[PDB]
């Protein structure tokens, strides 16, 4: 109360019942407030960023929850890391936070001038699965219902599927393009999925070894670490930031992440002990290669 | 008179269970009460398999939302497949692929280090147990009921709850509290109740 | 006087052991003394003397409660439990041939622990 | 890392826990001998459970070594237990008194 | 400290058949063991004890979760 | 119309052909027959029904059906009278909570009074639970063989207020009713997954992204039903599940038929090219109602611009977004037709349950 | 504590300064606000509204940060930017006084 | 005039003449071997230097 120049607990403010101009009210943090988010050690300029507060009303939760793509700012993982968070309360601090310390300013690294955020692990493999041409079942298509299911949880404005019959089969590149048209860019690069070292073995689909985007229309190749991965220079999010802004780059990162995650929600992905088990012929071939290594080593020994 | 009473302090409510006022070495009495806390596995508590893969528990999915196999089996923990290749913790996967057959046969096996092991023969044991050669099974998405296209590797992996609790480590202090007398700054740490 | 003695005696492990053996033989109530008046009863039965009598004299380790079954140490778990308590009392009062009796009871407890390890 | 975590693991921390008054000790109610045990378990009590683990992608909530836990497995008693703390205070002299 | 009332994973009440299963397993181990001390049973290289038929006779289905948590859960009365 | 075809019912029985089982049961429990309550397995076949409806039925039976628990009233665990130092209130409460009961009356209050008058470690069993309240039980509501915590020698444990608590398995898992045992689509062909070339696939010869299975087989297991009333217990469960789903769909319909008075659950926008966007928010709703609504709306409006929902784990709510090339009244009436379709198919399922199992 | 010793080598009222202002035709600093200057202007105006409350915006806003941000965007900020790098020993401060209503505004988005 | 701290389980520990059940009722772990020192309400382990 400015009239009394003292602070008061609302437990005894029942009779006053009102505020007045020149009064200062200390109110609980709400969704949409800006909060400073830090992880020691603070080595980079992006170690302290301003995120928007999303209050989780479930009382059983006591952790700080943040998108996996945001870890690249703080070099954090979820193996037990602890991070600091303080909500600015002064008006100058809030203005400064939301205008200068917002994490959109740190999307492009101050260190290497490239992007730091992107798709990591789950979303990278999900984008690869979604954008590839053929699945083991044949063509990589989905009906209208599952195409809409992909866009269910992107928080954007969902596109128009009124032109598709319920039995119409939408390609993965189709839905990725319907997402990328909101920020049309041009991208043409080989994907990390295509490697010369693998090439002699396994038959690469010729429609997957070259990624091409024209004005947001992804019509070629797959999306993987080179195109959407975090810290990939010249990736699609870097171009989105250059053309439309780092905030739009973060929005596109989230949207593409949700596309990939939902496509894997319906496509599934796993690693098994038999994925890493060689066939007996392959085991004999590995033995032969190692025997040749040891043979030339023993030739050195004989010399 | 004057007051030197002790305040509880901790945000997490506790229960008292201690009837004792002992007789110390200096021949004087002291309190020594014991507080009991009800600790389930909260979101944020750390777990780890015997191969050294730590992981913070962040999801509380009801039993209906959990993915389930064709024959009703659902997991307790869902761990990301990406946690394996960089760490090369193949012991965890072999433990799972042996534990499936062991659970089906109702046996317990020795997986001590440097004992003879044949991954091919363990997988053939899985096959002769009625499951697939790999531990993979047909799972259905719990939320939507749709089946995943890829057969999912699911089995019993021994897991440990590391004693780094979220409720112990979380802290939040308001705009006031105890201050250091010398520099006028808040005291250090959660124990000092500020800073 | 009586207060510090009550605290100290209540906190000995020996008091707990003797009191639980008394509870087993139904000499003291299986409640824990609800009001001081029954606490005197529990002290008298467990230790053998009222606290004032304990302070009066200087020989305290013998009149402790002894099992009111006198089991034939020659159902198996009952025998082991009561013989172990008797050997605990004998050690506390320093009975003459404690060492060889402890050796043979250690052998018997080893056999019983093996048979309990089979159940594990 | 396992040598560290197995020693950090919550379980039956002390067989005589009720008699003790220990600061910051956690007693995990349910423990299981691993389906794949080792020679070490002849000499020490195992600490943990044979949780059913699915190595799969589910909504991306388990990225960067997080774990998705069934709420029912939590409720039924998985990895639950009791956590203990102790508050002891002695009088400075006869000047003080509890009350 | 005991076999859980229900399987942790799924909730099938294995606790009904627990108390029967401990004694039945003890009896079956008695027959399948040989000249081997109880503390050396988890060390025998010529010892194989399958509880599949026993649990099946208990009426517990061919579920990995239920059988795991039945045959593996430690009993406090056995160690303390 | 027979959506719900034949149903197999098979209780889980104790096989006294094993000598060890018979000897153990007679040695401690004096058990010579099957238990008063048995876990029954129910396998059901559905035809001409969307996957969403079958999975919603499955989920509802799993956790969302209001089920009963045994619980301890606060203060029931007598700290003074319970001597045992190992049987904490938390451990015994957890043991007693997850005893699957088949309770017909909600006023049955049980009490535990166990004194270990001996030198052996006495084990408390479920037969130690003494009922003093409500009508006298002519049939036990739980098996008398459950192991509640043991007792050390000379120790006692007294719990005087153990009552029957109603809840749904979603909030607390002790209310979970059914456990799944099977689920498979009968119209989709399946590969021989035993072969190497197909081991890494789900087995179905169609992708999940394109499949629309209409013939299912849903297998559920119920943890404890009375031995001589298995069919009636199963029918009660299935009819209750259908009733719950109908009730929740009707609750959504209640706000649907109120296209004015902008309640903070329905917000309708007309935007851009005469398109209508409808957002529905229900707090504490799950993927059951959301997936049902989405599936049946997409059935009713095959050329819809966009229908989709999201049950975010936080915010604890379902937000259903429908965009269609129609006026607000037209979209509302189409969605009401979809809701009535859901109600109709679940009434058909209930009627077929009664026809089939009986 | 021993200071590890490399032991390396090397009128209390200041005279008042007259504020000399560079004429607008000789200002060499950029005519576009730096994000620092824009942030500072928005913060200063937002706090001033927090303490005073008067405004010149025809649209009602419920938060001072929004009123200040929109005042900056619509080029009616009642604050001048004084850019100053000079202090001569002669006791003279050389500053450039910039009106943000004439300067270009950075992204801030 | 001296008192020397006794390691739990050593031949001068009182538990050395107590049986496993006797330790159980006293308050010791029957299965734990000992090898630590009790000093001012704590347990201390003299490590192998
Ligand atoms: Mg870390
Ligand atoms: Zn189970």
- Global structural class of chain C: mainly alpha
**In oligomeric terms, what are we looking at?**
part of a larger assembly
SSE run of chain C:
HHHHHH
Q: What distance lies between the first and last C-alpha atoms of chain C, to the nearest angstrom? A: 48 Å
What is the tally of helical segments of chain B? 3
Largest interface: B-D, 86 and 66 residues
As a percent range, the share of helical residues of chain C equals: 55-70%
Gyration radius of chain B (Cα, Å) is 25 Å
| Largest sheet geometry of chain B | 4 strands, antiparallel
- DSSP strand count of chain C: 0
Topology of this structure?
This is part of a larger assembly, with 1 copy of chain A (303 residues), 3 copies of chain B, 1 copy of chain C (120 residues), 1 copy of chain E (80 residues), 1 copy of chain F (358 residues) and 1 copy of chain G (109 residues).
Chain B: E1 15-16, E2 33-39, E3 46-49, E4 54-61, E5 68-69, E6 77-79, H1 90-105, E7 109-110, H2 119-128, E8 136-137, E9 139-140, E10 152-161, H3 166-169
Antiparallel strand pairs in B: 1-2, 3-4, 3-10, 5-9, 8-10
Chain C: H1 2-11, H2 13-24, H3 38-47, H4 51-56, H5 76-93, H6 98-118
Chain F: E1 4-11, H1 19-29, E2 37-47, H2 51-64, E3 67-72, H3 89-97, E4 110-115, E5 122-125, E6 129-131, E7 147-151, E8 156-167, E9 179-185, E10 215-226, H4 230-256, E11 266-271, E12 275-283, H5 287-300, E13 306-310, E14 317-324, H6 328-356
Helix pairs in contact in F: 2-4, 2-5, 4-6, 5-6
The complex binds magnesium ion (MG) and zinc ion.
Zinc ion binds next to helix 3 of chain E.
């Amino acid at each position: 109360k400015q009239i009394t120049q003292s602070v008061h607990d609302i437990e005894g403010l029942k009779q006053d019942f009102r505020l007045e101009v020149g009064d200062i009210l200390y109110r609980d943090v709400v969704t949409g407030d800006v909060a400073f988010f830090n992880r020691q050690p603070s080595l980079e300029r992006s170690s302290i960023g301003v995120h928007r507060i999303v209050v989780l009303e479930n009382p059983k939760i006591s952790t700080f929850q943040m998108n996996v793509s945001a870890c690249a700012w703080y070099n954090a993982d979820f193996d037990g890391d602890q991070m600091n968070l303080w909500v600015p309360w002064s008006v100058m601090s809030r203005v400064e936070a939301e205008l200068l310390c917002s994490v959109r300013n740190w999307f492009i690294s101050t260190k290497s001038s490239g992007p730091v955020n992107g798709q990591v692990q789950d979303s990278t493999v999900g984008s690869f699965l979604l954008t590839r041409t053929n699945t083991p079942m044949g063509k990589n298509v989905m009906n209208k219902l599952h195409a809409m299911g992909l866009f269910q949880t992107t928080q954007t404005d969902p596109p128009c599927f009124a032109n598709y019959s319920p039995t119409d089969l939408l390609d993965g590149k189709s839905v990725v393009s319907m997402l990328l048209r909101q920020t049309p860019i041009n991208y043409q690069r080989a994907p990390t999925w295509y490697s010369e070292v693998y090439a002699p073995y396994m038959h690469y689909n010729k429609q997957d070894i070259s990624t091409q985007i024209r004005n947001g229309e992804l019509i070629e190749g797959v999306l993987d670490k080179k195109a959407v991965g975090a810290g990939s220079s010249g990736g699609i999010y870097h171009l989105i930031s250059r053309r439309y802004g780092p905030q739009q780059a973060l929005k596109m990162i989230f949207a593409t992440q949700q596309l990939a995650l939902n496509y894997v929600r319906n496509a599934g992905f796993t690693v098994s002990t038999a994925d890493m088990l060689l066939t007996p012929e392959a085991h004999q071939e590995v033995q032969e290669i190692i025997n040749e290594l040891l043979l030339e080593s023993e030739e050195i020994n004989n010399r | 008179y004057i007051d030197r009473s002790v305040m509880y302090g901790f945000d997490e409510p506790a229960v008292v269970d201690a009837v004792m006022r002992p007789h110390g070495p200096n021949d004087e009495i002291f309190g020594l009460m014991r507080l009991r806390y009800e600790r389930n596995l909260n979101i944020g508590d750390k777990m780890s398999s015997r191969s050294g893969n730590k992981g913070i528990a962040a999801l509380a999915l009801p039993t209906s939302d959990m993915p389930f196999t064709e024959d009703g089996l659902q997991p307790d923990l869902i761990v990301n497949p990406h946690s394996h290749p960089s760490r090369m913790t193949n012991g965890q996967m072999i433990e799972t692929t042996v534990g499936l057959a062991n659970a089906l046969q109702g046996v317990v096996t020795d997986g001590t280090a440097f004992l003879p092991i044949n991954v091919q023969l363990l997988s053939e044991r899985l096959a002769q147990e009625g499951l697939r050669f790999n531990g993979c099974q047909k799972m259905f998405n719990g939320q939507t009921g749709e089946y995943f296209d890829a057969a999912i590797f699911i089995g019993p992996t021994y897991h440990q709850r590391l004693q780094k609790f979220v409720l112990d480590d979380r802290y939040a202090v308001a705009s006031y509290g105890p201050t250091d007398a010398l520099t006028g700054q808040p005291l250090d740490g959660k124990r000092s109740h500020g800073g | 006087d009586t207060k510090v003695l009550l605290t100290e005696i209540l906190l000995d492990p020996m008091y707990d052991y003797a009191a639980t053996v008394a509870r087993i033989d139904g000499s003291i109530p299986m409640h824990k003394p609800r009001t001081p008046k029954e606490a005197e009863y529990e002290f008298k039965t467990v230790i053998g003397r009222t606290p004032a009598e304990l302070l009066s004299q200087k020989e305290f380790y013998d009149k402790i409660y002894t099992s009111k079954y006198r089991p034939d140490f020659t159902k198996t778990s009952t025998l082991i439990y009561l013989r172990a308590y008797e050997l605990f009392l004998k050690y506390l009062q320093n009975a003459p041939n404690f060492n060889s009796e402890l050796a043979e009871f250690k052998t018997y407890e080893n056999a019983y622990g093996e048979q309990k390890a089979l159940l594990a | 890392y396992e040598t560290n975590q197995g020693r950090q693991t919550g379980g039956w921390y002390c067989f005589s826990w009720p008699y003790r008054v220990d600061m910051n000790r956690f007693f995990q109610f349910y423990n299981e001998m691993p389906l794949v045990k080792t020679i070490a378990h002849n000499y020490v009590i195992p600490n943990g459970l044979n949780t059913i683990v699915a190595y799969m992608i589910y909504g991306g909530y388990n990225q960067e070594d997080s774990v998705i836990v069934s709420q029912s497995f939590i409720d039924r008693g998985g990895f639950a237990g009791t956590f203990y703390r102790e508050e002891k205070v002695e009088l400075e002299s006869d000047i003080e008194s509890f009350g | 400290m005991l076999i859980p009332v229900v399987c942790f994973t799924c909730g099938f009440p294995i606790g009904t058949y627990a108390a029967i299963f401990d004694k039945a397993r003890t009896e079956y181990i008695k027959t399948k063991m040989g000249g081997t001390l109880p503390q050396n049973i988890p060390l025998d290289a010529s010892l194989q004890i399958e509880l599949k038929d026993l649990i099946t006779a208990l009426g517990i289905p061919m579920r990995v979760c239920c059988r795991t948590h039945l045959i593996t859960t430690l009993d406090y009365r056995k160690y303390y | 119309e027979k959506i719900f075809q034949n149903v197999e019912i098979k209780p889980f029985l104790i096989d006294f052909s094993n000598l060890f089982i018979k000897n153990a049961a007679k040695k401690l429990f004096q058990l010579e027959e099957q238990l008063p309550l048995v876990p029954v397995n129910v396998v059901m076949d559905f035809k001409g029904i969307s996957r969403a409806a079958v999975h919603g039925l499955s989920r509802v039976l799993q956790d969302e059906i209001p089920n009963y628990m045994l619980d301890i009233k606060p203060g029931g665990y007598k700290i003074e009278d319970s001597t045992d130092l190992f049987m904490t209130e938390q451990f015994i409460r957890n043991r007693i909570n997850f005893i699957p009961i088949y309770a017909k009356n909600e006023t049955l209050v049980f009490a535990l009074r166990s004194l270990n008058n001996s030198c052996e470690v006495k084990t408390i069993y479920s037969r130690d639970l003494i009922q003093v309240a409500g009508p006298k039980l002519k049939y036990p509501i739980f098996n008398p063989t459950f192991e509640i915590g043991f007792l050390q020698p000379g120790k006692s444990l007294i719990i005087e207020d153990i009552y029957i608590k109603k809840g749904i398995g979603r909030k607390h898992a002790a209310f979970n009713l059914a456990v799944k045992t099977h689920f498979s689509h009968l119209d989709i062909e399946q590969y021989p997954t035993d072969k190497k070339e197909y081991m890494a696939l789900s087995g179905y010869k169609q992708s999940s992204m394109t499949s629309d299975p209409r013939h299912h087989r849903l297998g559920l297991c119920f943890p404890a039903v009375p031995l001589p009333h298995i069919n009636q217990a199963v029918r009660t469960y299935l009819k209750n599940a259908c009733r719950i789903i109908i009730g929740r769909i009707q609750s959504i319909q209640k706000i649907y038929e109120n296209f004015e008075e902008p309640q903070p659950e329905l917000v309708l926008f007309s935007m851009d090219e005469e398109k209508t966007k409808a957002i529905i928010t229900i707090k504490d709703e799950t993927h059951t109602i959301g997936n049902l609504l989405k599936t049946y709306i997409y059935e009713m409006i095959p050329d819809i611009s966009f229908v989709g929902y999201q049950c975010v784990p936080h915010k604890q709510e379902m937000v259903l977004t429908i965009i269609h090339k129609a006026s607000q009244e037209d979209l509302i009436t189409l969605l009401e037709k979809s809701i009535q379709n859901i109600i109709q198919t679940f009434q058909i399922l209930e009627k077929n349950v009664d026809e089939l199992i009986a | 504590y021993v200071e590890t010793e490399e032991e390396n080598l090397v009128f209390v009222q200041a005279s008042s300064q007259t504020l000399v202002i560079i004429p607008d035709n000789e200002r060499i600093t950029s005519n576009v606000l730096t994000t620092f200057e824009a942030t500072r202007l928005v913060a200063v105006r937002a706090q001033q509204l927090a303490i005073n409350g008067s405004t010149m915006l025809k649209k009602k806003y419920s938060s001072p940060i929004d009123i200040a941000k929109q005042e900056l965007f619509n080029r009616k900020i009642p604050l001048l930017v004084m850019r100053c790098i000079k202090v001569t020993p002669e006791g003279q401060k050389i500053v450039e006084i910039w009106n943000p209503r004439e300067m270009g505004i950075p992204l801030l988005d | 005039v001296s008192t020397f701290p006794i390691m739990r389980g050593s031949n001068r520990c009182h538990t050395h003449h107590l049986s496993k059940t006797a330790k159980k009722e006293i308050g010791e772990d029957p299965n734990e071997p000992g090898g630590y020192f009790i000093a001012r309400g704590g347990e201390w382990v003299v490590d192998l230097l």
